[PDB]
Amino acid sequence: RKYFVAANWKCNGTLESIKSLTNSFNNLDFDPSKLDVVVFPVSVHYDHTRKLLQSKFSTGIQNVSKFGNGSYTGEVSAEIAKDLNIEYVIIGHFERRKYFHETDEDVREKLQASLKNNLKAVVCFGESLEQREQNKTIEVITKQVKAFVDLIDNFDNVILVYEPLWAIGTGKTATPEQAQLVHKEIRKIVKDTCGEKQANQIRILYGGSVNTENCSSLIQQEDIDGFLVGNASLKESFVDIIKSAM
Amino acid sequence: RKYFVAANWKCNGTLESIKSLTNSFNNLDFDPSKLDVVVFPVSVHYDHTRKLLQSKFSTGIQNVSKFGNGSYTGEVSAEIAKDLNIEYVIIGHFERRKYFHETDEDVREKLQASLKNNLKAVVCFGESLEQREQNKTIEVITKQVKAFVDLIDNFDNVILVYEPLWAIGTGKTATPEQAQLVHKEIRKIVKDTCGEKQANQIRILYGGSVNTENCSSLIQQEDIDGFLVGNASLKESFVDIIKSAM
């Protein structure tokens, strides 16, 4: 299966910084038919970003509505994204589950809406420290995946992402090996619920803290197909993280 | 006080529909130094819309974050809007209060962030059918306005909007006199908390169902200084609604 490296800029950037950053990314020589590289800018920065980034890179938005077009002030629907030729959408990021109040039900409705409009989706999930310390990681992940897994029609169009919440901000570090065990378990749930062929083609990205020093060890694990990068994707050195997967 | 007519497109539009619409809007000749006309397109359409509309039209976005730049996937901060020269932001729309659990506290935080970054704000509030039937209209409104009016101001930069939630899809209808009775009460609250000179300069818009048939009767009322139009703003005839305020 193809490796997938994504840059989640979150709520950051100005017109100038974005200009300089995309200028550095464009200096990288790679083949877009082998590797998938996607940049996710702030909604109001989309046109500016698409224009500056060469065609080798794909682009997407950080959130999509669970409703369609209509009376929902502040929302961007799947149909609007499709008309704009937007290719990817992030769904279920922990910051949205935490700060805003998105549930597994919201996740499934957003996925259903994206697929219904022929959009590609990157869906996030993961367990917290409290759930981990009491040995419930697998029970939590099974519940989270089971919420939307039956909607997946084309296993090349939905990318899964495991966010180790127990490590994020807690002052703890998730080793590649610890990550690999979870990814292995996730692939097994997809196999048992959907099928072997289906489990073999779907990408499962890391999603924890990735930098230039640990990217190689992570990508080497057999069930880790790439990453959704945060803070490091706002730096010019992000090119070295891409290089680790080619 | 200068009249203020705003078009809230909500979650609607395509690249092509926006092109046709902005074309018809551009036929209208008005003097922006006498009348404020603002359009609020979906975030990913903002650039496309701003370039299509002539400078006499102002533009803005339908929601801003209460947080700043950082790890808030999916959000747009006041600082980012400022860098883009976005002039207005909508805050507190009932759809966001209903479907996205936004509270009075959130409204206060977002207004503070916007004024801090030199953005003009359009703040919405209103009572429901149940609150109205229990004769709680004045008490509810008083509390909602007091949540943010709190010495955070320059009275030309903040526009208040009254949304009669009790008439939005309830089968009930608000008459221009019923709308005027509430606007009068709202202006009094600004008078009791900020002063008469301040109360007399601030705009208060009507955010109920506005169409070509009732616009003139509504704008004629003493304390109604304009509107925040919904579905009617997505039609060519919207210009006739702008003319009623000339």
Curated annotation (Swiss-Prot), chains A, B:
Signal peptide: none
NCBIfam families referenced in this protein's UniProt entry, alphabetically: tim
The name this protein goes by in its record: Triosephosphate isomerase
Binding site for D-glyceraldehyde 3-phosphate: 8, 10, 169, 228, 230-231
EC number assigned by the record: 5.3.1.1
Effect of residue 94 to S: 5.5-fold decrease in substrate affinity. 3-fold decrease in substrate affinity
Gene: TPI
Record flagged with keyword Isomerase: yes
